[PDB]
Design a protein around this ligand. Structure first.
Ligand SMILES: COc1ncc(C[n+]2csc(CCOP(=O)(O)OP(=O)(O)O)c2C)c(N)n1
Ligand SMILES: COc1ncc(C[n+]2csc(CCOP(=O)(O)OP(=O)(O)O)c2C)c(N)n1
Ligand SMILES: O=C(CO)[C@@H](O)[C@H](O)COP(=O)(O)O
Ligand SMILES: O=C(CO)[C@@H](O)[C@H](O)COP(=O)(O)O
Ligand SMILES: [Ca+2]
Ligand SMILES: [Ca+2]
Ligand code: NA
Ligand code: NA
Lengths: 664, 667
């Protein structure tokens, strides 16, 4: 068959699957099919029989609404994605959700949809390949060597995150990153000139990319030559400016916004079949077309050749090969748990009053030698977030390093780190001031949705940061993290809880962990062995009474010391008081009911929550018959001590609120 | 005095104020002082005695950590910002907070700090000036004519939001926007080449800006020439790339990251005075330097001339002049309240089962003729968010229009709209799918912090959107808005609540209002006159029983219909039940204790919340002895009706959960 006919198989499957679902996006798949045919058939290195092959090329669809493009490609090339799944596009529990999801579908590398994040993930995958190659390749043994290809459209280009990640990709000279821009002139509001007029090629040259202008995206020869040129440029990422017609093939809807996001309609599909010369019924693909698209034979040959290369590497570099396998599987060192517990015990035995930002740095220092998979960084806040340890080596200085200077790019950093975690081989950590989680907020959500391990180091957690004032002082950010599905959030009260939280984060296998860390020094609490072991349960009894409590304080982070002081004053008066430290609500909620009852007995309604964050969260644990010593407003610019007084974080106020609650 | 001596007054006040506070940022004020001296003394059109003059130039410090720069300028030029306030930099309830805050300080135009948002606000101020000029100027009467000047640094340039807003500024040919880039080579991690290597000039060329390269930012004559050039270019925004030395004047810290964000130290300040030739003690400024910096006489003259221009305009164009004054003051038309109430009453009397996105469009259509100040838009989702009405006119087509095609730029859109609201003359509305509030999330917070009026139209609010799936289906986003100080969030259950929420939003002068709107059609509920009036109280009794209820359902948005159906089933079985519609938790919480008790009586603990959003929020209203029919997970890609079934939003499940709750209460 001709290359145009092979590409038209994508067009047919895509328009027909959208039509059957009565939902979805035919335009971009139809517009990009010729580009996809060249990339996938002539260049992409992959094995449909093993989508997890460590050295495969990675493909990312940043314009993820065009999901039928990737489903068509996966089906045609021989992945485990049968025609009946394409006939179930957008249907409950199918392998073909409306935007592609990692884990749902063989061969999907990332979850896209939210514009701009796919290209960010691709930048992270390319950073991962470059760094892993530098760490593991040896003379005569280049076990890491693969490309990262991304498709993206006008939406991704308009989004700010594209500026963040493509600027950084230029600095890092990511020569194996090749992006294809679907330059079709159309967005949802219509012809893009009314709102998008950049000289995109000039912009990307300003980032230090190699840019190929004016590619005819409907001409295989033009596309193929451009990809060859891009592959030959090894010191710069490449952008291929592909001029396409959205909805290519449709007489009446090609080149129109109408083709973006609704079924074409039966009559228009019939006219499109006529225009394309496509004679096959919906969901019919002839054996000649499968034979030319199928990648099983070539893919298995390429993966087998790589396996033989890896076996030879392992004979010359046995310890390195074992590390490669461990890290690509995402497994932890066998002795990590024991060594981390030893560190935690040493902290409990040797008290220190330090900020939890510093306790975090100390945990990175302790873990660093044990976790060569770390690939950490901060968004231009290394000396403030405290993300460097003695063994940090920045990848802009040493490609085999373990640290990224992300610049002032919080959203891009977080979505890059999602690509790093998706790639395999690394454990990313990212960092900024907690307030600026709001810049990165949807990438944090995406880490949780995609079940990715990433430690998110968020310092300067409250009014305790002081004079920088209300634009910087978090109030409501922790509450929002706490209610995000699959997110783990820890607000440690001292250096011991900080180390436990770090351990919890690195040991997660199926989602991210946010650490909520202080600028100001935090006192260390005394703990029994049982209490020390129970920090990891997220909530535990720190101070107690004999018998059933009359009053329970629930406190987190920097406010535990305040709650303890109130407990001491009320205990001396003869109140049966308790203090619960709640560093992680999510870990606590996952405990068994007997444990939760032992900490927060259901019969004890006189509960006082104490936290320098938004009060409304705490109704979850205090109900309607308790009290909350929290924030209800933005902060103010002043020294931290005076802010804690101004906002009621005083022993007198905590005691008064407890007494008012006990007097009923 | 020489220009350098006058600039050195800024350097002295800035380093000394930081030193006294033992906190703050001396580097950027010291690096930009010469640029500021030229801009403020030779070009800026302003009156220190009236910071609210409608036609003043607007200045924005996007690198807001350099707050002592703006406090020095305001003090030296004669604003009501006494030296004692500079001595109280970063102290509780001073007029000199660590990052500048609009409202705290005479002459501060916006609250900055969070990088990139100041340049976005400036783009919005420049859009506002261009649009207002096109709407109001008449032949011989150019009553709107002012510049927007912004300072920004490497951090703002790295941030994605700068790409969004500067790309759009290029499309809109904002010739009165002039930005100065503090190109000093330093960020917090050190020398920026390790992480920031853009050819920034070429980037801005790609946006359609007029770029002036390689300006010596310590040479007044060079700066002045560059500003003159930028003013002469009327068809492009301008970027002045000013090469500066961070901490200029400090022998040991100039050009270093150490100068960014800590006091220089007393010993270093002494050496800096010696290098600069600045002899005056901390907080000392001689009368001769005030005489050269003061802007009161020139500012009076400029505003007086403008007032005479406006008087001539008002004689020739009396109705237009009255509209200009009304809109610049942020006042509403005198008949708006009555006309909006008439619309709301007509909707209650004439049911329609439509999506609340459509009810929103219908409210825009109804209000549009009454509110010529609207300056609305969507982030490339006009046909989905339903933000156009018959009178919309995009400003890229006609500069006197009322609508902005923002493109796929949610964060930039929202921070531009903050600039629009700060400028005066307009009532902005912005729009995207609710999920993508997460892209714009800190700009929403900034609108709340700055007490700005903006209506945020967030459609596709739940799993009810269907097949687009979990990356698009909000779950926890509304709860995040609900816990934001000074935010107002409305999740209307029908077209009537939607119109009430729109009215509330446009009439809310001291903060923003988010509308949480459905893709799918919503049933209209029956209401008495009192219930209709009670929608605006945020939470109200929609269905009731005689005597104390056994059970109270609390529901919002699309789930009110489900809660009412469950109420009807249980009522028919003899259960004493009540339904509370809670379109706005923030408005409900602001009602007095007696009203809140009347809706959610403390004696009734068997409370069932029903909302297709994160369950954990609802403990606030149901306590520990109730039930929540909510989401606890991400969504799924499927038809909406199957998702509602899958996730338990069915009459059978709500009734079962309510009966299970009652069984537990009884035993
Ligand atoms: C912030 O994140 C975000 N915001 C909005 C949308 C909705 N949306 C999908 S596509 C597109 C605009 C056009 O995107 P574009 O790639 O040009 O596509 P085609 O129409 O296929 O050419 C828009 C506006 C999204 N998915 N993600
Ligand atoms: C997302 O929002 C955000 N993130 C981080 C910061 C902290 N910060 C202030 S400044 C700067 C980096 C350097 O900013 P830059 O203008 O080059 O300054 P100078 O050091 O004065 O040259 C950084 C990193 C902020 N305020 N806002
Ligand atoms: O610019 C910033 C914050 O935006 C920093 O310079 C801080 O203002 C001070 O840093 P720390 O002393 O809190 O680490
Ligand atoms: O691209 C998008 C959403 O990201 C749109 O095309 C929607 O997928 C369909 O729009 P509505 O029918 O919900 O308005
Ligand atoms: Ca497009
Ligand atoms: Ca700088
Ligand atoms: Na290349
Ligand atoms: Na100009």
């Amino acid at each position: 068959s001709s290359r145009k006919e092979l590409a038209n198989a994508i067009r047919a499957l895509s328009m027909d699957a959208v039509q059957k679902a009565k939902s979805g996006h035919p335009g971009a798949p139809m517009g990009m099919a010729d580009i996809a045919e060249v990339l996938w058939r002539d260049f992409l290195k992959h094995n449909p029989q093993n989508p997890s092959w460590a050295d495969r090329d990675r493909f990312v669809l940043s314009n993820g609404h065009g999901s039928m493009l990737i489903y068509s490609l996966l089906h045609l090339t021989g992945y485990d994605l049968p025609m009946e799944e394409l006939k179930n596009f957008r249907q409950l529990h199918s392998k073909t959700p409306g935007h592609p999801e990692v884990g749902y579908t063989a061969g999907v590398e990332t979850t896209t949809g939210p514009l701009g994040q796919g290209i960010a993930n691709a930048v992270g995958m390319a950073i991962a390949e470059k760094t892993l190659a530098a760490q593991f390749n040896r003379p005569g043994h280049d076990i890491v060597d693969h490309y990262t290809y991304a498709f993206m459209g006008d939406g991704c280009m308009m989004e700010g995150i594209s500026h963040e990640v493509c600027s950084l990709a230029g600095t890092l000279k990511l020569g194996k990153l090749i992006a294809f821009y679907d330059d079709n002139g159309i967005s949802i509001d219509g012809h893009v000139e009314g709102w998008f007029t950049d000289d995109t090629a000039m912009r990307f040259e300003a980032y230090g990319w190699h840019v190929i202008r004016d590619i005819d995206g409907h001409d295989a020869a033009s596309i193929k030559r451009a990809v060859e040129e891009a592959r030959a440029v090894t010191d710069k990422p490449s952008l291929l400016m592909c001029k396409t017609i959205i909805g290519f093939g449709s007489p009446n809807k090609a080149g129109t916004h109408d083709s973006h996001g609704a079924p074409l309609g039966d009559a228009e599909i019939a006219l499109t079949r006529e225009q394309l010369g496509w004679k096959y019924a919906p969901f019919e693909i002839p054996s000649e077309i499968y034979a030319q698209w199928d990648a099983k034979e070539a893919g298995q040959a390429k993966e087998s050749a790589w396996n033989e290369k890896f076996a030879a590497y392992a004979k010359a570099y046995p310890q390195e090969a074992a590390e490669f396998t461990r890290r690509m599987k995402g497994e932890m060192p066998s002795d990590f748990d024991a060594k981390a517990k030893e560190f935690i015990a040493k902290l409990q035995a040797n008290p220190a009053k330090i900020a939890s930002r510093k306790a975090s740095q100390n945990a990175i220092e302790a873990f660093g030698p044990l976790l060569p998979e770390f690939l950490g960084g901060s968004a231009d806040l290394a000396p403030s977030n405290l993300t460097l340890w003695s063994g940090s080596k920045a990848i802009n200085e040493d490609a085999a390093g373990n640290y990224i200077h992300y610049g002032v790019r919080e959203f891009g950093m977080t979505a890059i780190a999602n690509g790093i975690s998706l790639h395999g081989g690394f454990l990313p950590y990212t960092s900024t001031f907690l307030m600026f989680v709001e810049y990165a907020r949807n990438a944090v959500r995406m880490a949780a949705l995609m079940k990715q391990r990433q430690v998110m180091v968020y310092t300067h957690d409250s009014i305790g940061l002081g004079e920088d004032g209300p634009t910087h002082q978090p109030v409501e950010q922790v509450a929002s993290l706490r209610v995000t599905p699959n997110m783990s959030t820890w607000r440690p009260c001292d250096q011991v809880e900080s180390a436990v939280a770090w351990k919890y984060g690195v040991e997660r296998q199926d989602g991210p962990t946010a650490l909520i860390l202080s600028r100001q020094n935090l006192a260390q609490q005394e703990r029994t062995e049982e209490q020390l072991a129970n920090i990891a349960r997220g909530g535990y009894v720190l101070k107690d009474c004999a018998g059933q409590p009359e009053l329970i304080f629930i406190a987190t982070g920097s406010e535990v010391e305040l709650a303890v002081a109130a407990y001491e004053k009320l205990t001396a008066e003869g109140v049966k008081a308790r203090v619960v430290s709640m560093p992680s609500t999510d870990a606590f909620d996952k405990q068994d009911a007997a444990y939760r009852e032992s900490v927060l007995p259901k019969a004890v309604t006189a509960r006082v929550a104490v936290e320098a964050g938004i009060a409304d969260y705490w109704y979850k644990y205090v109900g309607l018959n308790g009290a909350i010593v929290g924030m209800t407003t933005f902060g103010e610019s002043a020294p931290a001590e005076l802010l804690f007084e101004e906002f009621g974080f005083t022993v007198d106020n905590v005691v008064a609120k407890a007494k008012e609650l006990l007097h009923h």
